[PDB]
């Protein structure tokens, strides 16, 4: 009855995506090198730089404001 199990994996490997292929390649190399697979567990964002925006622009969350901090020793 092993052929039934073989067919199960065969459909699974055929249905598997490229992300799973890339994910398994990293994990295969990690166990070969001895590193735990967990912790390897995508970038759905768009970022840009605003040079000197007007004083009326709204502050959104996760915003990073470039600062020129004065010399602490002076």
């Amino acid at each position: 009855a092993a052929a039934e199990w073989i067919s199960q994996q065969r459909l699974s490997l055929y249905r598997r995506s490229e992300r799973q292929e890339l994910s398994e390649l990293v994990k295969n190399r990690m166990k070969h090198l001895g590193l735990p697979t967990t912790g390897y567990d995508h970038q759905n964002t768009l970022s840009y730089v605003l040079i000197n925006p007007p004083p009326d622009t709204r502050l959104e969350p996760s915003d990073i404001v470039y600062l020129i901090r004065s010399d602490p020793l002076a």
Binding site: I6, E21, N28, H32
Partner: protein, 34 residues
């Protein structure tokens, strides 16, 4: 000839573990047990 009908060490069989590259189609192969 019968007519065509209108109506119908030993090796393990598995997939090679370490795929060398991405896109290598997994073929069930004759594999060494170890």
């Amino acid at each position: 000839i019968a007519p065509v009908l209108e109506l119908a060490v030993e090796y393990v069989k598995g997939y090679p573990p370490n795929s060398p590259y991405i896109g290598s189609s997994p073929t069930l192969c004759h594999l060494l047990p170890v």
